[model samples]
Target: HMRVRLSKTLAGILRHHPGRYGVRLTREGWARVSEVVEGLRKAGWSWVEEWHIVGVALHDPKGRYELRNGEIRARYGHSIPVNVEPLPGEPPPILYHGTTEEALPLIMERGIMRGRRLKVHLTSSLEDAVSTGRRHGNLVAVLLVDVECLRRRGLKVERMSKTVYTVDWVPPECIAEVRRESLGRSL
Candidate 1:
């Protein structure tokens, strides 16, 4: 599922670090990444490659993958897997103008559209249309959501005082693809 894989030496590091890194090892002996590498070198192991070292460092404190043999060495050879976890962050609330499951995809895709800001559409209800217009400052803007499709999916277009129109709230993370389509810079 990812680009990196574990090396024999890197795997050993997890085994040795069960206590120091506050992790656990199996019912077998393992070595630290550094230790394994050193041991292999001492034992005349030459097949060890740079990718292995880099993969190990990515998880360990040394992501630089430097030959820090003088600085640090792998203790347990068991490698602890490395992956970045998602952290909680604030997100913009999704406003679904119409209610429908089929509209979800369109809503999401349009909401993610580049160049223009996203907006929900007005439903069939005259009142809802008014409310949508009012919320958008009475000016038409490129709507990101598909209100008509949502309405077909069971989203009641009938306007109510406190209708649950918001579709979902998603956190903004990672750099969005540059809107090359909108760059109209005809140089």
Candidate 2:
């Protein structure tokens, strides 16, 4: 629990508010390691240290943070509008987006918009998408996005990592279907 909390806190700083913390992110989303430690310490988290930061970066299940050389940054989920250099890869045939049924009405109309973050995050598998939606609320629904159709429609998509892909926006035309599981039964 402590590690999770720390990891989120670090992400909040690294991904959103380096300026508020008296630091800055490089073009590729990296900050000096020492500056991060000092910023956190000055921000009332005196317990923060290099080891704790490294531990979270090394152990986070979602692969949220990355440490390279003497700098660190959040790998994805940035709301601060950083210009991520395009890292493109061939996405799988299908991608999944986790959301609540309540959001479906609007999502079906407007497609999936990046509400707070810069891009719409999509997972390669249904299970991962379901898990992502569970983080938002209890009654989760998953949307199956058709990558081939999107590409055919001239929409660009990029893979962020092994499990995560991103698109500027997904139009309703490309969302192939929406599904929900009910008490272990497909609905």
Candidate 3:
């Protein structure tokens, strides 16, 4: 619970809204390590430190955070506008986005939009996508996205990490399928 809270709070500060916690984020979303620790401590995370912050960023399951040049920032999933350097990697032919069954109809109609996030989050595997969807609720569905088709349409997709990808948008025509299956046991 402590780690999750700390990590979410860090994301809120560095990726979502720095001004909410009185922390200043750079144009690239980097926040000074010391200032981050102090801000977190002041926000009732008294045990936070450089090492804990590093641990959270380094060991996150999704590799959502990054530590570089004595500063920390999330690799993706930013709601606040920031100019992050594009990561260099070739994504797989297909990617999966996990969402709830409740949202499937609208998603199938409108495609996968960023909503409050700056970019749509995608995973390389169905299992990862299922897990991501389960994080929200029990009734989960994984959408198969056609990466090649979208790329051919001149859409931009960025590989943020081994398991995570970011895209500006996904059109409905680019979605290959909305897979609904029992992923509880498999995941």
Angstrom error of the Cα, residue 159, model 1: value is 46
* lDDT, model 1, position 139: 31
> Tens digits of per-residue lDDT for model 1 on 2-25?
224344434434433434433333
**Candidate 3 structure quality by residue, lDDT tens digits, 43-149:** 88877789999999887887888888789888888888887776788889899999898888898788899999989999897898998888887888899999998
Cα error, residue 83 of model 3, in Å, equals 1.7
> Which one wins on lDDT?
3
| Regions of candidate 1 where Cα sits further than 4 Å from its true position | 1-8, 17-35, 42-45, 49-52, 59-187
**RMSD in Å for all candidates:** 18.7, 2.7, 2.6
Model 3 stretches with alpha carbons more than 4 Å out? 182-187
Judged by lDDT relative to the true structure, which candidate is superior, 1 or 2? 2
Show where candidate 2 strays beyond 4 Å. Answer: 86-89, 182-187
Worst 10 residues of 1 by lDDT: 174-183
TM-scores of all candidate predictions against the true structure: 0.19, 0.88, 0.91
